[PDB]
């Protein structure tokens, strides 16, 4: 009897792709031939955040555009002051194998986690002066790959158990759960609206979810291999992703299809992390080829090449105002380009 | 201006003390050698170091720290994770070694063990990390090959036309068939490793039983040889 369900799903996907091709009356590649190119993007290392020991596995800027988080595999999550490179806090993690990190918009909380299957929270504004474990959001049956702060009392988490979660710091349980993907979720991104969020997994697809509804509203499968990078477009209507196939793709929440594909015959190494600028005109993508590529979001051409990194890039972030960019690779030397 | 100069001085003192603590931690970090532990559920990976100086069970990691010849080793065993080992394994690309145990007594599962060993050896991220093959359960292999209830030819017909190498180290009183099968499995693993081998990472097979206790010294020697070959390559002496 399962043959009937399989045929129904096949027909549903066929009509979906038919509607997609129908709405594909044009393509962003040809429509963007009139605008002026961005040209070569000269970005030099303004400061280097030396001090980390093990390979940095993640990083995330803050709303203040001055402090950033950087978690390493040695069990240390350091808070770096970009303006002066001053170590303000160094949280020692119970599990040395950390795979993510976050920085709440208010800066009062910081999240981390990894193979420990637990999302550890830490308060920076503690009256005791010495930070400590604020909350342990356990329950996931897979490695925590990415995490973002939805609010001071609501947080998002992506684990390798093929499911995403939305927790409340005051409760410590899964306030909401999402089980759309089939592979380990590797990264996600929240939009300025603070209600919708997209996440990519090893299923070579990116799925969208609403914090209130709790059901997958849209799915994209234009990629070829596992998605290891994802970031929301500054406008909140689109988002870019990157796969291990050495290719990035920009999907739109309204077209339900790919309209921009960043790739090159000589770019064989995959992607690890991507991020947009304040305006989205450029698209920064970290590759495991020991360098990062800043493409033109509207033309898909290598406008800038950040070649200074003696390791596989792991994370790339942009400030809330886009004054500078941060790149953390496995060399333990988190660079700050601009 | 003082309202900000005092804050700058306080932040400088904080950064100084934080760097001092970071160096204090880096001391013990560099002093310890981080190893990974992989293997099948039926394998005795959780009992490789029968000594077990200290066994720490984290939220989802079966850590195992110990000391040999004043050198601190920290073998990490990830058991409480999904079967998909293509993403989190990347976290162990800087480990000193990867002890991969195989329950070679289970011939039907020996094929899956060989496939996993191949996928690990051919991994782009573990391409520079040696693999310490601990063929545990050798007593089970001996019993199974002496009982004659299971023929290795059904699972590996090459064993029928295979001959034991000359550089073998036969144990006293061991049956020729037992040694032949053991070294055939060892050479199968060595070939799986050599199919894509290179001077970046090497294999170190070892035959150990479920009741053995000298595994600590074996892992010590394996790590020593691995780091020695790595330094020699860095000096272009290999």
């Amino acid at each position, epitope marked *: 009897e399962l043959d009937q369900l399989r045929q129904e799903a096949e027909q549903l996907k066929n009509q979906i792709r038919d509607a997609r091709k129908a709405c594909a009356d044009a393509t962003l590649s040809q429509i963007t031939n009139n605008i002026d190119p961005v040209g070569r993007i000269q970005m030099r290392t303004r400061r280097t955040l030396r001090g980390h020991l093990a390979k940095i596995y993640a990083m995330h800027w803050g709303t203040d555009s001055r402090l950033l988080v950087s978690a390493s595999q040695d069990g240390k999550l350091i808070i770096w002051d970009s303006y002066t490179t001053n170590k303000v806090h160094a949280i020692p993690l119970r599990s040395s194998w950390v795979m993510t990190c976050a920085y709440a918009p208010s800066g009062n909380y910081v999240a981390c986690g990894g193979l420990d299957n637990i999302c550890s929270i830490y308060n920076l504004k503690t009256r005791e002066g010495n930070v400590r474990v604020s909350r342990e959001l356990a329950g996931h049956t897979g490695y925590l790959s990415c995490c973002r702060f939805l609010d001071d009392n609501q947080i998002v988490t992506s684990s390798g158990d093929t499911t995403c979660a939305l927790w409340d710091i005051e409760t410590g349980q899964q306030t909401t759960t999402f089980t759309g993907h*089939t592979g380990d979720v590797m990264s996600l991104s929240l939009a300025p609206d603070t209600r919708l969020f997209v996440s990519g997994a090893c299923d070579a697809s990116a799925k969208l979810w609403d914090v209130r509804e709790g059901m997958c509203r849209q799915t994209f499968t234009g990629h070829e291999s596992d998605i290891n990078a994802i970031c929301f477009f500054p406008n909140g209507n689109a988002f870019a992703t990157g796969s291990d196939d050495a290719t990035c793709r920009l999907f739109d929440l309204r077209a339900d299809q790919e309209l921009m594909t960043y790739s090159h015959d000589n770019i*064989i190494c995959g992607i690890t992390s991507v991020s947009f600028s304040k305006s989205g005109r450029l698209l920064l993508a970290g590759y495991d080829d020991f360098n990062c590529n800043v493409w033109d979001a509207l033309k898909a051409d290598r406008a800038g090449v950040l070649a200074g990194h003696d390791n596989r890039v792991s994370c790339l972030g942009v400030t809330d105002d886009g004054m500078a960019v941060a790149t953390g690779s496995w060399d333990s030397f988190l660079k700050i380009w601009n | 201006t003082e309202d900000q100069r005092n804050e700058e001085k306080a932040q400088r003192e904080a950064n100084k003390m934080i760097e001092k603590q970071l160096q204090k931690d880096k001391q013990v970090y560099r002093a310890t050698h981080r190893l990974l532990l992989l293997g099948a559920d039926n394998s005795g990976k959780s009992t490789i170091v029968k000594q077990m100086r200290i066994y720490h069970v984290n939220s989802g990691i079966f850590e195992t720290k110990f000391q040999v010849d004043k050198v601190n080793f920290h073998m990490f065993d990830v058991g409480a994770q*999904r*079967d*998909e080992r*293509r993403k989190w394994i990347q976290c162990f690309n800087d480990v000193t070694a990867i002890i991969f145990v195989v329950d070679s007594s289970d011939y039907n599962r020996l094929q899956e063990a060989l*496939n996993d060993f191949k*996928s690990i050896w051919n991994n782009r991220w573990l391409r520079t990390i040696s693999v310490i093959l601990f063929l545990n359960k050798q007593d089970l292999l001996a019993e199974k090959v002496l009982a004659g209830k299971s023929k290795i030819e059904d699972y590996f017909p*090459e064993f029928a036309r295979y001959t034991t190498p000359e550089d073998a180290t036969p144990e006293p009183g061991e049956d020729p068939r037992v040694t032949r099968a053991k070294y055939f499995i060892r050479d199968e693993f060595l070939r799986i490793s050599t199919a*894509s081998g290179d001077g970046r990472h090497y294999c170190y097979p070892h035959f150990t039983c479920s009741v053995d206790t000298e595994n600590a010294r074996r892992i010590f020697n394996d790590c020593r040889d691995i780091i020695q070959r790595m330094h020699l390559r860095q000096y272009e002496l290999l």
Partner: nanobody, 128 residues
Framework: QVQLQESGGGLVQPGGSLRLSCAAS????????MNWVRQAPGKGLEWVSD????????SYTGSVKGRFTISRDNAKNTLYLQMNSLKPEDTAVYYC?????????????????????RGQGTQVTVSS
């Protein structure tokens, strides 16, 4: 876009032969290593064979080494498994799995059962 359909299988008598086909779409089939695996009724996954991009490097499982033959046609991005002299133990559901990463020689398809890059499964039975 990423899809791996498979056809063939069915009922066969011992000692016969059969060619199972697998069409994969949504990527560059010439840049990904391919594998054929089989899961028997009630048993776990069992990798059968693997074939590289250009087919220069191919390997088979010792239990079925020689009887099966894996091939790949890049002109039409298709995979073929020609089994000859089948056995009653060959009855199982076969799957054509794609390597997770291109330009690499390492694939973890058989490690998990919920793997994504697979087909609906082609059932094969060998008996009189």
């Amino acid at each position: 876009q990423v899809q791996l359909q498979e056809s063939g299988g069915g009922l066969v008598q011992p000692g016969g032969s059969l060619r199972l086909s697998c069409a994969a779409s949504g990527f560059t089939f010439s840049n990904y290593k391919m594998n054929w695996v089989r899961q028997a009724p009630g048993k776990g996954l069992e990798w059968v064979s693997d074939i590289s991009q250009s087919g220069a490097s191919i390997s088979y499982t010792g239990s079925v080494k020689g009887r099966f033959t894996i091939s790949r046609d890049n002109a039409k991005n298709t995979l073929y498994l020609q089994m000859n002299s089948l056995k009653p133990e060959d009855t199982a559901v076969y799957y054509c799995a794609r390597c997770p990463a291109p330009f690499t020689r390492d694939c973890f398809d058989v490690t998990s059962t919920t793997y994504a890059y697979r087909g609906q499964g082609t059932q094969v039975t060998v008996s009189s």
